[PDB]
Design an enzyme around this catalytic site. Structure first.
Site, mmCIF file in Angstrom:
data_model
loop_
_atom_site.group_PDB
_atom_site.id
_atom_site.type_symbol
_atom_site.label_atom_id
_atom_site.label_comp_id
_atom_site.label_asym_id
_atom_site.label_seq_id
_atom_site.Cartn_x
_atom_site.Cartn_y
_atom_site.Cartn_z
ATOM 1 N N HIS A 25 -1.359 -8.987 -1.722
ATOM 2 C CA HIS A 25 -2.588 -8.613 -1.022
ATOM 3 C C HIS A 25 -3.636 -8.716 -1.920
ATOM 4 O O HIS A 25 -4.797 -9.015 -1.736
ATOM 5 C CB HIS A 25 -2.465 -7.181 -0.597
ATOM 6 C CG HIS A 25 -3.580 -6.919 0.541
ATOM 7 N ND1 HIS A 25 -3.574 -5.762 1.454
ATOM 8 C CD2 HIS A 25 -4.539 -7.544 0.823
ATOM 9 C CE1 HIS A 25 -4.571 -5.836 2.159
ATOM 10 N NE2 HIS A 25 -5.291 -6.965 2.143
ATOM 11 N N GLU B 150 4.686 -9.143 -0.877
ATOM 12 C CA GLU B 150 3.087 -9.127 -0.528
ATOM 13 C C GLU B 150 2.316 -9.273 -1.872
ATOM 14 O O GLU B 150 2.549 -8.476 -3.064
ATOM 15 C CB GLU B 150 3.198 -7.405 -0.052
ATOM 16 C CG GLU B 150 1.500 -7.247 0.222
ATOM 17 C CD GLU B 150 1.073 -5.733 1.033
ATOM 18 O OE1 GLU B 150 1.912 -5.385 1.570
ATOM 19 O OE2 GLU B 150 -0.209 -5.649 0.839
ATOM 20 N N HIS C 186 7.559 -2.422 3.425
ATOM 21 C CA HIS C 186 7.551 -3.991 3.701
ATOM 22 C C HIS C 186 8.788 -4.351 2.782
ATOM 23 O O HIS C 186 8.365 -5.009 1.749
ATOM 24 C CB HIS C 186 6.177 -4.529 3.588
ATOM 25 C CG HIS C 186 5.099 -3.917 4.402
ATOM 26 N ND1 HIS C 186 4.881 -4.201 5.745
ATOM 27 C CD2 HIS C 186 3.995 -3.083 4.071
ATOM 28 C CE1 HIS C 186 3.912 -3.548 6.345
ATOM 29 N NE2 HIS C 186 3.409 -2.864 5.188
ATOM 30 N N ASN D 229 -7.707 4.712 -7.580
ATOM 31 C CA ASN D 229 -6.940 5.213 -6.804
ATOM 32 C C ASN D 229 -7.764 5.025 -5.206
ATOM 33 O O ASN D 229 -8.556 4.863 -5.307
ATOM 34 C CB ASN D 229 -6.306 6.423 -7.111
ATOM 35 C CG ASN D 229 -7.548 7.350 -7.098
ATOM 36 O OD1 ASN D 229 -7.844 7.831 -5.973
ATOM 37 N ND2 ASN D 229 -8.039 7.911 -8.150
ATOM 38 N N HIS E 10 8.143 3.773 5.967
ATOM 39 C CA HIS E 10 8.268 3.662 4.495
ATOM 40 C C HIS E 10 9.654 4.416 4.214
ATOM 41 O O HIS E 10 9.782 5.619 4.624
ATOM 42 C CB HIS E 10 7.009 4.112 3.672
ATOM 43 C CG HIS E 10 6.096 2.995 3.597
ATOM 44 N ND1 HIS E 10 6.424 1.762 2.570
ATOM 45 C CD2 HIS E 10 4.958 2.600 3.956
ATOM 46 C CE1 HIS E 10 5.474 1.048 2.242
ATOM 47 N NE2 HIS E 10 4.562 1.422 3.442
ATOM 48 N N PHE F 40 -6.095 7.556 1.519
ATOM 49 C CA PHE F 40 -5.512 6.665 2.585
ATOM 50 C C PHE F 40 -4.047 6.434 2.715
ATOM 51 O O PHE F 40 -3.429 5.484 3.295
ATOM 52 C CB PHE F 40 -6.174 5.163 1.975
ATOM 53 C CG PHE F 40 -6.485 4.068 3.271
ATOM 54 C CD1 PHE F 40 -7.060 4.310 4.326
ATOM 55 C CD2 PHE F 40 -5.777 3.127 3.020
ATOM 56 C CE1 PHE F 40 -6.982 3.451 5.526
ATOM 57 C CE2 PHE F 40 -5.674 1.956 4.078
ATOM 58 C CZ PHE F 40 -6.170 2.194 5.185
ATOM 59 N N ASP G 40 0.725 -1.291 -0.027
ATOM 60 C CA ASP G 40 0.068 0.030 0.073
ATOM 61 C C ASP G 40 0.859 1.278 -0.116
ATOM 62 O O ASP G 40 1.218 1.656 1.027
ATOM 63 C CB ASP G 40 -0.873 -0.267 1.302
ATOM 64 C CG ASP G 40 -1.631 1.176 1.555
ATOM 65 O OD1 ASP G 40 -1.908 1.934 0.778
ATOM 66 O OD2 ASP G 40 -2.495 0.901 2.596
ATOM 67 N N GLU H 218 1.188 -9.687 4.418
ATOM 68 C CA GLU H 218 -0.367 -9.742 3.773
ATOM 69 C C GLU H 218 -0.305 -10.833 2.379
ATOM 70 O O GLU H 218 -0.561 -10.363 1.336
ATOM 71 C CB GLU H 218 -0.910 -8.397 3.397
ATOM 72 C CG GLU H 218 -1.405 -7.781 4.769
ATOM 73 C CD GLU H 218 -2.033 -6.184 4.550
ATOM 74 O OE1 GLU H 218 -1.472 -5.515 3.764
ATOM 75 O OE2 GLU H 218 -2.826 -5.627 5.187
ATOM 76 N N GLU I 61 1.502 -4.033 13.583
ATOM 77 C CA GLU I 61 1.160 -2.764 13.571
ATOM 78 C C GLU I 61 -0.205 -2.625 14.256
ATOM 79 O O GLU I 61 -0.993 -3.549 14.533
ATOM 80 C CB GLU I 61 0.391 -2.587 11.992
ATOM 81 C CG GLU I 61 1.193 -3.153 10.961
ATOM 82 C CD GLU I 61 0.802 -3.167 9.477
ATOM 83 O OE1 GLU I 61 0.050 -2.540 9.074
ATOM 84 O OE2 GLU I 61 1.431 -3.860 8.704
ATOM 85 N N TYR I 62 -0.044 -1.520 14.950
ATOM 86 C CA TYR I 62 -1.239 -1.320 15.754
ATOM 87 C C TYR I 62 -1.575 0.513 15.711
ATOM 88 O O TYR I 62 -0.645 1.184 15.352
ATOM 89 C CB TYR I 62 -1.214 -1.634 17.202
ATOM 90 C CG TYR I 62 -0.301 -0.789 18.228
ATOM 91 C CD1 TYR I 62 0.860 -0.821 17.967
ATOM 92 C CD2 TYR I 62 -0.716 0.017 19.226
ATOM 93 C CE1 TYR I 62 1.992 0.027 18.740
ATOM 94 C CE2 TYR I 62 -0.064 0.569 20.202
ATOM 95 C CZ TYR I 62 1.552 0.750 19.808
ATOM 96 O OH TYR I 62 2.423 1.366 20.631
ATOM 97 N N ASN J 126 -0.689 8.447 6.877
ATOM 98 C CA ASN J 126 -1.170 7.564 7.923
ATOM 99 C C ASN J 126 -0.100 8.043 8.849
ATOM 100 O O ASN J 126 0.016 7.432 9.991
ATOM 101 C CB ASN J 126 -1.272 6.313 7.817
ATOM 102 C CG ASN J 126 -2.162 5.870 6.660
ATOM 103 O OD1 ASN J 126 -3.209 6.368 6.392
ATOM 104 N ND2 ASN J 126 -1.914 4.477 6.028
HETATM 105 O O1 LIG Z 1 -2.936 1.735 6.090
HETATM 106 C C1 LIG Z 1 -3.244 0.569 6.467
HETATM 107 C C2 LIG Z 1 -2.191 -0.664 6.829
HETATM 108 N N1 LIG Z 1 -2.945 -1.760 6.979
HETATM 109 C C3 LIG Z 1 -1.899 -3.009 7.034
HETATM 110 C C4 LIG Z 1 -0.736 -2.914 6.144
HETATM 111 O O2 LIG Z 1 0.403 -3.792 6.426
HETATM 112 C C5 LIG Z 1 -0.131 -1.475 5.822
HETATM 113 O O3 LIG Z 1 0.776 -1.571 4.557
HETATM 114 C C6 LIG Z 1 -1.248 -0.515 5.480
HETATM 115 O O4 LIG Z 1 -2.031 -0.857 4.351
HETATM 116 MG MG LIG Z 2 -1.663 -4.425 1.921
#
Ligand SMILES: OC[C@H]1NC[C@H](O)[C@@H](O)[C@H]1O
Ligand SMILES: [Mg+2]
EC number: 3.2.1.23
Lengths: 416, 208
Positions: free
Chosen positions: A227, A225, A200, A406, A166, A410, A10, A270, A346-347, A413
């Site tokens: 996803h 990844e 990642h 797109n 990132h 989002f 992402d 993911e 991730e939290y 972050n």
């Molecule tokens: O911003 C949401 C977040 N969720 C989990 C993913 O691992 C991240 O790369 C990102 O997409």
């Molecule tokens: Mg992803």
């Protein structure tokens, strides 16, 4: 390319020659690889530095390898040997390899609080003492291990104050430079972070050197990844993609295994849970027993992870999704059979005006021994700069370049 | 017999409690009292082992943790492998218990007493190394106008698989009847019989 199927993170999708280009001149008889490992007594008062060195080119009787260890200006240990490993099996040993063992008394231990480094110099030379080539790295003495459900550094239980980062610059896109890396590390440490997750993919090689010198723990992540696949494990459960995935993991471990700041390997992000993940998990445990392996995919507690590493699990509330439930973190620790430590990969999603309820995670992390912290999502907003008619810069997000489809704002972050 | 016919699970408990000793394990850590303690456990198992309603044996109550407890724990596991053994003394999770069985541990709050801490029940399950189920041998003290916060235990018991419930303290008020001058009965508690020293209303803890 077909490599794009494995790179669905992402983030902005960009292209080109975005990291440095070099020429390197080596002699025909050369050091082709070396590995450094540190073993300790029960109280960390004696260490053994074990260096393995491999050469390429023509083997001669007069070749020798010396490894010396320096603390500032003082030589602290040294060893010399000819080539020739110990017998490995029925056909003999490696004629083109050698292992030195160096004893060190009362070594100064590396940690994120006190990042003590030594310098190891590896020389290839002749018996009469003519130098052929030297190579060197920074060495930190530390032991990472999982013991009785806890992740220990140097015998003590870690509490991870981590963030996901990132490689992003609003003018230069995905091009990283020293100045921006140093600015990030100072701001992270000034705000009480001790750890960073490479979300990642492997970073620019200078990143690991700066985390060694300033003191951050690193989670180093394979560039895999998938996803966007349906289901998520369509490629990672297919043996025809096992070659492509193995190159992404094996080459990362071979590049980064000597850095003291790297304390955990990650298999990617993911990609569901397939048999290719279990195979690569086992490959790393066998070539590098000194670091735990983690992987979040497939419900965060599969057989491909040494650490339970959920993303966005809540403190008290369950989220009972089919196949991949997100238990609350206090409940997860105590499911029948469960013994691993839990660190959130991730939290606390920092999108816009956010981080409500952050104190409730920190209260749990301090009360429960096996909750050992987590990595916030994430460090820096991925916005880009556009210019208006008067040439005034403004911050842009998804859709502002005529890109379609797109995902709009989002991409922003960050805490900064 | 009545618990067999109507259907209740029973925890059957040996007549051993030495709460008034200092420290609590002065007798239960002494080999000269091992004969007396063994008669109390062995004769109970030999009398009651055929009843289907008995599902758990208990070694007694509030006697600290001594080597006599570990010996008797092992005696029962060997003559009757068909029922778990529990014992709360000595901090509720010693080697003499198959079940972690705290008394009055709270749902969310720790009570970090020296030597014998009462962890909150959700935290206790997940201490490094811990694998046993947790059943409170006493919780929710029903003294007088009480049982506030009862719903919070039942919410936890339903959410966590290894929290498998507990025993409220307790069923019936231990009060006695006295008569006044006109022969009217009234409910009496500690101290009302000229007994001294005594612990006053602390004997009335029941739901009924
Ligand atoms: O911003 C949401 C977040 N969720 C989990 C993913 O691992 C991240 O790369 C990102 O997409
Ligand atoms: Mg992803």
């Amino acid at each position: 390319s077909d490599g794009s199927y494995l790179e669905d993170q992402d983030m902005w999708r960009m292209s080109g020659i975005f990291r440095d280009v070099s020429l390197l001149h080596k002699p025909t008889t050369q050091i082709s690889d070396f590995h450094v490992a540190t073993r300790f007594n029960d109280d960390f008062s004696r260490a053994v530095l074990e260096a393995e060195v491999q050469m390429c080119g023509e083997l001669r009787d007069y070749l020798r390898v010396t490894v010396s260890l320096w603390q500032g200006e003082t030589q602290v240990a040294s060893g010399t040997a000819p080539f020739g490993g110990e017998i490995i099996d029925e056909r003999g040993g490696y004629a083109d390899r050698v292992t030195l063992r160096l004893n060190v008394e009362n070594p100064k231990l590396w940690s994120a609080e006190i990042p003590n480094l030594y310098r190891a110099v590896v020389e290839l030379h002749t018996a009469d003492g003519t130098l052929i080539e030297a190579e060197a790295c920074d060495v930190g003495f530390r032991e990472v291990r999982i013991e009785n459900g806890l992740l220990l550094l140097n015998g003590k239980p870690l509490l991870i104050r981590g963030v996901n980062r990132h490689e992003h610059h609003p003018l230069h896109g995905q091009v990283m430079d020293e100045q921006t890396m140093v600015q990030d590390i100072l701001l992270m440490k000034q705000n009480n972070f001790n750890a960073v997750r490479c979300s990642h993919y492997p970073n620019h090689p200078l990143w690991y050197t700066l985390c060694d010198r300033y003191g951050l723990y690193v989670v180093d992540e394979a560039n895999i990844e998938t996803h966007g696949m349906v289901p998520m494990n369509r490629l990672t459960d297919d043996p025809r993609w096992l070659p492509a995935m193995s190159e992404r993991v094996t080459r990362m471990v071979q590049r980064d295994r000597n850095h003291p700041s790297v304390i955990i390997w990650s298999l990617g992000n993911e990609s569901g849970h397939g048999a290719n993940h279990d195979a690569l998990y086992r490959w790393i445990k066998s070539v590098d027993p000194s670091r735990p392996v983690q992987y979040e995919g497939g419900g965060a507690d599969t057989t491909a992870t040494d650490i339970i590493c959920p993303m966005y699990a809540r403190v008290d509330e369950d989220q009972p999704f089919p196949a991949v439930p997100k238990w609350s973190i206090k409940k997860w620790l105590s499911l029948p059979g469960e013994t691993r430590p839990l660190i959130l990969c991730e939290y606390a999603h920092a999108m816009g005006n956010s981080l409500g309820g952050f104190a409730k995670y920190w209260q749990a992390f301090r009360q429960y021994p096996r909750l050992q912290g987590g990595f916030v999502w994430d460090w820096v907003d991925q916005s880009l700069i556009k210019y208006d008619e008067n040439g005034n810069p403004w911050s842009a997000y998804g859709g502002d370049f005529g890109d379609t489809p797109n995902d709009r704002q989002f991409c922003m972050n960050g805490l900064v």
